[PDB]
Design a protein around this ligand. Structure first.
Ligand code: POV
Ligand code: POV
Ligand code: POV
Ligand code: POV
Ligand code: POV
Ligand code: POV
Ligand code: POV
Ligand code: POV
Ligand code: Y01
Ligand code: Y01
Ligand code: Y01
Ligand code: Y01
Ligand code: Y01
Ligand code: Y01
Ligand code: CA
Lengths: 609, 609
């Protein structure tokens, strides 16, 4: 907060550092006559700095003043070069300011006195960060491209500029147009600026030059959701084979869209980026067909063979828990509240029959399966993000967490079976619930179950969790009242609130109306019970019918319009994942390779519409 | 009703008092020739009054008649001055009527005979009240401004008018334009009328002059929801620091918008006014940023430290009720329906162990907390509205009532503990429910829980209370039938309706289907039970599914479009409250103060867009 407070103070401190001098006053407004009196009488020094360490020329450019600064140059011609020596607008010179305010006559007077066009505004007000409402780059070519000024673009190339110049982020000027809020004007700048390569000794095209994330402008249009620069960039990568009346056969280049090894690709970048406007690109004319190609041919068959193996694995795990080793209890019961008949066997006792060795096969299969789950999910964070970049992906998939939590609870049950620890029902019951509810992951490989299963996630991490805080508040208040109302009664005749953890659990069940809840009719209940439970029942059904509301504004007004789009993005995230963690010989590469067609070492996709 | 009946009779009695005289007849229509016969033959008196005590001239102005009234002035020149001597349009003269009907030639003939322009229509038809469909003021400048007549505005300033003149409410003419139903025409009158200050010896600007509620025109635009006069008035309070291409840095005056001590402010006026169109102003360009400033920096941290203290306080209170002093009962049970095992200890017995003194700390903390709740909420009605202005604020907050009802029930439990009164479970159970459901107040300081918690209030004081009247009717009829059906049976085999208060409570539970309800299958139930309960079950599920309807027209068609707006208004109401009841040294004032920037003793807000 203090940096935005410091930035708010520097703009006000700038407006005060003008008013206490005449030499910086005649170069703010159009008062040229006093400035001729300021120079010849006392012969004062003219390099007086303002708040940002700048000369009076930067105030002239920021308010469009040309006339007094001529006498500044007939007397002190060296004024052109000196940039801002500040720390917020650092390295910004007078040329940058006249570019974004689009002054043209100042360029003809500066450059006649050998001005500078390769200056780099590296200050913090020009960087790519959400505090700054503009991002233009660092160079004066970059600024004129972004305020949509064709004249200043050609006026710099005449004066020794450079279009292959980059930011500290590595963005060239072609990258920066893709980042602009005004999309259609960026398309015209892109065609204007790309048309100045004109050098064969240099090998790199300007639209192939990557920034420091290794992204081209084409891939930067994909990551940012710039769909009209995506379609515009796609004509460099089309080829029209033939036109047959209403038909045409278009061949798509597919080189930077599909994966080519260790280099990151457009399909994987759209999924693994934090931006949501990138998912509109997943419906475009080389990409929508590419995704439907590899899902219908290789993705969906493998995802169904993976879900048929997983289903048999959990059915095998379920039988090992149903047949877990149990024996009659040894000590006698300690109290009439003791319900236990059976306890689990020791390791020396639990494998002593042919019926046990059928279970040992399934137990070893279960253990082997949990290790293979931890060998393909846990080694993919130590080269990846340890808890950060894996932690970002959790909103895309909770089933990563669920299948590791399953495999954790299997191996805890293994350890407790090895050391004869008591309480194997605790890790098993988590594992039965975790392992079976992971079958819902494979719902995304079906037309019927895919868009319904996404609705489940967005209501548990939205409106269900939202309801649970308000539910916990009501439960805690009424369970405490129900506890102290029945605290003086006999629990043998009404035991719902006999101690305080049972009173919490009973009130929870009463909230959901899943237990019938306290009545005897042979005995006098306290009168406060009938008052409190009537009030509880009105509030609980009010709240329950309110959760039913919020789940209907959640779906039909937020996530029913995007059922297919969120589900098609799940097919892409699955198909990308199911190719990276699968061998090369099982997965043919998508598209048709050249070198048998005179097309190169490229893989091409044909679309006939 | 009788005053609107009296007002309806006076307009009809006015239409009859014309027809019985010739001297008031020739001055209604264009019959000038008979009027020259009415004057010279019998030489009659001309000051004959109508129904509102008015002369015949007011009938001429009300129907645009100029020609006969000239001979009225060549014979009786003193006719100009005499106002209405009525009590509904009191003090209205002929100049007011010709202004609102926009006659111009009558002004040139009256004022040539020294007419009056400082007349005050103080009658009841011109006051600000919902019976009157216009509110124009009292002065003839005020009327011409409101019917949008620029010519008559300049025609009065030439004739000795006064723009600094006020109503009996204290509204100047600039106040009255803000109150008009035609917003855009009021903006042009505002620029026309403000441009006539032109006096340096007088100190007060016309747009700074307050009415009797101490409100400027700027604050009157805030209170009334006049958003286009709010934005128009805001340009007097902006200052553009610089423009950098697409960027500009605007500095907002923020003096009459933020609080300056005991004088009432714009943020607190929007919240504490009864009007709902004022909440649109809470989204405007100096106000939306000011609110998000002090909530994100000071409001939200303090509201979370206040909710973390309150949560620990209620957890401490909950433990004191769970560990309340109880002993085995002394007398024997009086009947087999007596379920009580325990009774509470006396004061001499309830503090006799180290386990009691841990509870005495928590009980004293609970008591001290309830006094501090009553010291910051109850002394704020005796200088405020005792039950009226506090009573108006209840629709904004029920948690005022809930936290005082909590603190009332704590101290009743204190008194009953001090005097060994029996029945402490009655004030405690209210206090556990009231104290825990007050945690839902702190839901408004979160993005997730804020708009959901407002939905709860608007359905309990709307559709739930609406359903409860219809529910009580059905419950009362069927409980009485269920009572008399089972009135001849043995309640040992079916006890749901054994007496009439249990029959009411059972039918309530049966309505909500939260108890399973009567079946035995070993015994013959009355045949009327199966008829009545089938009819009850159809009606109860019909009604329950109808409550589910009404809660979906309530939200998605009334209060889902305004979830963020009702929740942002709750942030303003919380931030205003949490600054007034909090010290000065903990709360830095919002904005940047001048006097180190040449800007005055004002606090300014900078907005860069
Ligand atoms: C996203 C989902 C939301 C989850 C919310 C979390 C809710 C879940 C919380 C669960 C807490 C469960 C533990 C309580 C019981 C422990 C067992 C025990 O022995 O206690 C004992 C008493 O102990 C107490 O009195 C503790 C209760 C005090 C108030 C609890 C509030 C704190 C929870 C923080 C929640 C704040 C969150 C509010 C949210 C805004 C029981 O007594 P006894 O042994 O039976 O008899 C004593 C005998 N004698 C008295 C006759 C001598
Ligand atoms: C979401 C909506 C929330 C609603 C909030 C709920 C409102 C809550 C307000 C409750 C106020 C009730 C006062 C309680 C104080 C009783 C003290 C007393 O002396 O009583 C005595 C008689 O008891 C009776 O016979 C009277 C029963 C209570 C009165 C009617 C309450 C029903 C509310 C109807 C209107 C409903 C309107 C609601 C509209 C919706 C009991 O004393 P005792 O016999 O000596 O005890 C010994 C027996 N023992 C040993 C077994 C212990
Ligand atoms: C916003 C929320 C809505 C709230 C609505 C309020 C509803 C809540 C109302 C609650 C009233 C509760 C009190 C009744 C029972 C008292 C106990 C008692 O002793 O009574 C006794 C009889 O007494 C009666 O018969 C009274 C019943 C007559 C009709 C009740 C309607 C009046 C309620 C006004 C409602 C109109 C509102 C309608 C709305 C349009 C019980 O008899 P017994 O002792 O068991 O046995 C006698 C023995 N013997 C016969 C064999 C000899
Ligand atoms: C929201 C919708 C609301 C619906 C309104 C509900 C309609 C209400 C209309 C009800 C009309 C019923 C007539 C009641 C009079 C009976 C008198 C008699 O003599 O019967 C005798 C035989 O009893 C029987 O065996 C016949 C049972 C009733 C007939 C069929 C009723 C079911 C309705 C089907 C159609 C449903 C259509 C509904 C469509 C929806 C009983 O006399 P007893 O044996 O001598 O008694 C001694 C036993 N005791 C000592 C134990 C006491
Ligand atoms: C997709 C849906 C269809 C799929 C088809 C399968 C689903 C449904 C199939 C069968 C279910 C119905 C048959 C009941 C089971 C009885 C088996 C038995 O003989 O019990 C024996 C022990 O039992 C065990 O030891 C098995 C425990 C787990 C082993 C898991 C299989 C391992 C084999 C390798 C597989 C590798 C896994 C592959 C890895 C990827 C003997 O005990 P008993 O005392 O004689 O008990 C019978 C008497 N009683 C009941 C009266 C007490
Ligand atoms: C949340 C609750 C539910 C969770 C899901 C339950 C978990 C278990 C989930 C899925 C279990 C398996 C489902 C059976 C196959 C489905 C039928 C089908 O669509 O065809 C599939 C065939 O796929 C295969 O050929 C292999 C399927 C598994 C082999 C074992 C689709 O593949 P294809 O593209 O049509 O291939 C054409 C084959 N051809 C080339 C020979 C022409
Ligand atoms: C936010 C969520 C986390 C917060 C953490 C806290 C939440 C959870 C924390 C603890 C809950 C779980 C522990 C159980 C409680 C046992 C304590 C005990 O020793 O009992 C004793 C008496 O007990 C009392 O006297 C306490 C009664 C209320 C005192 C309130 C605290 C005052 C201390 C100052 C605080 C100032 C408050 C601050 C003001 C703003 C001994 O009785 P006993 O007979 O030996 O009982 C045990 C045997 N039995 C059960 C088998 C019968
Ligand atoms: C209806 C059921 C639910 C009802 C609610 C349950 C009742 C309990 C409710 C809230 C309980 C407390 C919640 C923990 C804090 C929340 C985290 C957070 O958002 O940061 C908060 C930090 O606020 C603080 O720094 C102090 C918070 C409490 C301290 C004790 C927000 O403040 P900030 O603006 O981000 O401050 C930045 C700090 N910095 C300047 C150091 C950088
Ligand atoms: C003795 C043998 C035959 C045991 C059988 C083992 C298989 C049933 C297990 C072993 C490893 C498992 C895989 C390990 C990890 C994953 C990643 C997992 O990814 C997610 O959960 C994605 C998260 C999301 O996006 O929601 C999908 C299932 C899969 C392929 C698992 C499918 C089931 C496998 C093949
Ligand atoms: C032994 C008992 C107490 C188990 C309790 C453990 C819970 C923490 C588990 C049980 C089932 C789990 C759920 C089962 C299924 C899913 C998958 C997923 O839900 C979806 O809708 C899938 C996401 C998608 O479709 O993209 C998000 C997590 C969730 C709700 C799980 C969250 C964790 C849960 C609630
Ligand atoms: C509000 C939403 C988000 C769900 C939270 C509801 C809570 C009130 C639930 C969640 C877990 C429940 C607990 C889960 C396990 C148990 C153990 C259970 O049995 C025992 O403690 C041991 C057996 C005995 O001696 O009775 C008693 C209830 C209790 C504390 C439950 C009390 C009610 C709890 C706290
Ligand atoms: C021994 C000590 C530490 C006991 C602890 C005392 C606090 C937990 C209490 C004492 C006074 C209470 C305050 C008294 C009154 C109010 C006003 C209250 O305002 C409303 O209820 C607004 C109503 C609405 O608009 O809905 C908000 C909570 C607050 C600050 C209370 C918060 C909790 C406080 C600080
Ligand atoms: C022992 C029993 C019989 C007590 C009788 C009634 C109680 C259950 C009290 C304590 C909790 C109270 C509720 C707690 C929260 C609120 C605040 C408010 O609800 C909201 O949605 C908050 C307002 C907002 O968000 O602006 C309206 C009153 C209400 C429902 C209260 C109404 C009265 C209640 C139900
Ligand atoms: C219609 C909506 C708005 C709620 C109102 C429903 C009523 C039918 C409820 C509200 C309060 C209830 C009462 C709350 C307290 C009691 C005390 C309860 O126990 C006793 O009277 C003492 C013990 C005994 O001797 O049985 C019997 C039911 C009764 C009258 C309840 C009967 C049903 C009532 C009137
Ligand atoms: Ca039941």
């Amino acid at each position: 907060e203090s940096w935005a407070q410091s930035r708010d103070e520097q703009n006000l401190l700038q407006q005060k550092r003008i008013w206490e001098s005449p030499l910086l006053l005649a170069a703010k407004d159009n008062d040229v006559q006093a400035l001729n009196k300021l120079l010849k009488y006392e012969d004062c020094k003219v390099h007086q700095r303002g708040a940002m360490g700048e000369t009076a020329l930067h105030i002239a450019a920021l308010y469009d003043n040309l006339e007094a600064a001529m006498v500044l140059m007939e007397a002190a011609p060296e004024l052109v070069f000196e940039p801002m020596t500040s720390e917020l607008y650092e390295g910004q010179t007078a040329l940058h300011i006249a570019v974004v305010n689009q002054n043209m006559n100042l360029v003809r007077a500066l450059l006649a006195r050998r001005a500078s066009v390769s200056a780099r505004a590296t200050g913090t007000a020009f960087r790519r960060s959400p505090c700054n409402l503009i991002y233009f780059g660092e160079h004066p070519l970059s600024f004129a491209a972004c305020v949509n000024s064709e004249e200043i673009v050609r006026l710099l190339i005449e004066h020794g500029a450079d279009i292959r110049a980059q930011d500290s982020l590595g963005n060239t000027v072609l990258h920066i147009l893709i980042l602009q809020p005004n999309k259609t004007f960026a398309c015209q700048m892109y065609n204007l600026l790309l048309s100045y390569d004109r050098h064969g000794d240099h090998l790199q095209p300007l639209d192939l030059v990557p920034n420091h994330q290794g992204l081209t402008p084409f891939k930067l249009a994909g990551v940012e959701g710039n769909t009209v620069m995506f379609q515009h960039l796609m004509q460099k990568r089309k080829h029209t084979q033939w036109t047959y009346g209403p038909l045409t056969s278009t061949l798509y280049d597919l080189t930077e869209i599909d994966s080519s090894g260790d280099e990151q690709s457009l399909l994987e970048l759209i999924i693994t980026t934090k931006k949501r406007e990138a998912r509109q690109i997943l419906d475009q004319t080389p990409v929508k067909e590419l995704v439907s190609l590899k899902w219908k041919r290789y993705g969906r068959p493998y995802f169904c063979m993976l879900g048929a193996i997983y289903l048999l694995y959990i059915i095998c795990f379920t039988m090992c828990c149903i047949y877990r080793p149990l024996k009659p209890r040894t000590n006698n019961r300690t109290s009439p509240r003791d319900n236990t008949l059976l306890q689990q066997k020791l390791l020396q006792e639990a494998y002593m029959t042919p019926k046990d060795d059928i279970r040992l096969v399934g137990e070893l299969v279960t253990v082997i399966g949990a290790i293979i789950i931890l060998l393909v999910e846990v080694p993919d964070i130590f080269r990846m993000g340890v808890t950060r970049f894996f932690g970002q992906t959790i909103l895309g998939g909770p089933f990563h967490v669920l299948i590791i939590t399953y495999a954790f609870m299997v191996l805890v049950t293994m350890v407790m079976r090895l050391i004869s620890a008591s309480g194997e029902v605790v890790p098993m019951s988590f594992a039965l619930v975790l392992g079976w509810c992971n079958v819902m992951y494979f719902a995304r490989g079906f037309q019927m179950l895919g868009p319904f299963t996404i609705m489940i996630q967005k209501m548990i991490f939205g409106d269900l969790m939202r309801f649970c805080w308000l539910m916990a508040v009501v439960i805690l208040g009424f369970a405490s009242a129900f506890y102290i109302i029945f605290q003086t009664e006999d629990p043998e005749e009404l035991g719902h609130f006999y101690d305080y953890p049972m009173a919490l659990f009973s009130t929870f069940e009463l909230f959901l109306t899943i237990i019938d809840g306290p009545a005897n009719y042979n005995v006098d209940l306290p009168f406060m019970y009938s008052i409190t439970y009537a009030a509880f029942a009105i509030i609980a059904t009010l709240l329950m019918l309110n959760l039913l509301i919020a789940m209907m504004g959640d779906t039909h007004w937020r996530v029913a319009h995007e059922r297919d789009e969120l589900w098609r993005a799940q097919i892409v995230a699955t198909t990308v994942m199911l190719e990276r963690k699968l061998p090369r010989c099982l997965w043919p590469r998508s598209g048709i390779c050249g070198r048998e067609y005179g097309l190169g070492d490229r893989w091409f996709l044909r679309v006939e519409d």
